[PDB]
């Protein structure tokens with residue numbers, strides 16, 4: 001019923017390993033660019 | 049700078065600038081430290097200008 005059984009699990013292992021690498025690296029690229037905004041500071045100086 | 053001999057300028061320096069503090073200054077010299085450059089941005093938004 002499922003001749004692809006073994007091959008799909010071998011691929012599944014490779015998919016998990018690549019995701020364990022790519023997810024934190026892509027997460028790191030997101031945080032890298034966004035850090036400009038996440039640490040920005042604002043000040044309001046109206047005339048008096 | 050101008051029409052003047054360097055002899056004259058040195059004579060006046062030794063006359064009117066001799067009273068300055070000597071070479072030693074009691075160990076309190078200003079030593080300029082290096083100044084960190086920071087890649088950064090500052091925006092003062094003012095649409096009335």
Ligand SMILES: CCCCCCCCCCCCCCCC(=O)OC[C@H](COP(=O)(O)OCCN)OC(=O)CCCCCCCCCCCCCCC
Pocket residue numbers: 010011012014015018019022
């Ligand atoms: C005309 C072209 C049209 C293409 C359209 C594609 C549609 C997008 C579908 C995306 C599916 C994700 C991967 C499944 C395959 C698999 O699981 O990969 C199995 C293969 C092992 O294979 P093996 O051991 O059999 O051989 C081995 C021979 N050396 O390694 C992997 O684990 C790679 C998958 C890693 C994790 C996925 C990360 C996704 C990144 C985005 C890339 C998308 C590119 C899109 C290009 C159009």
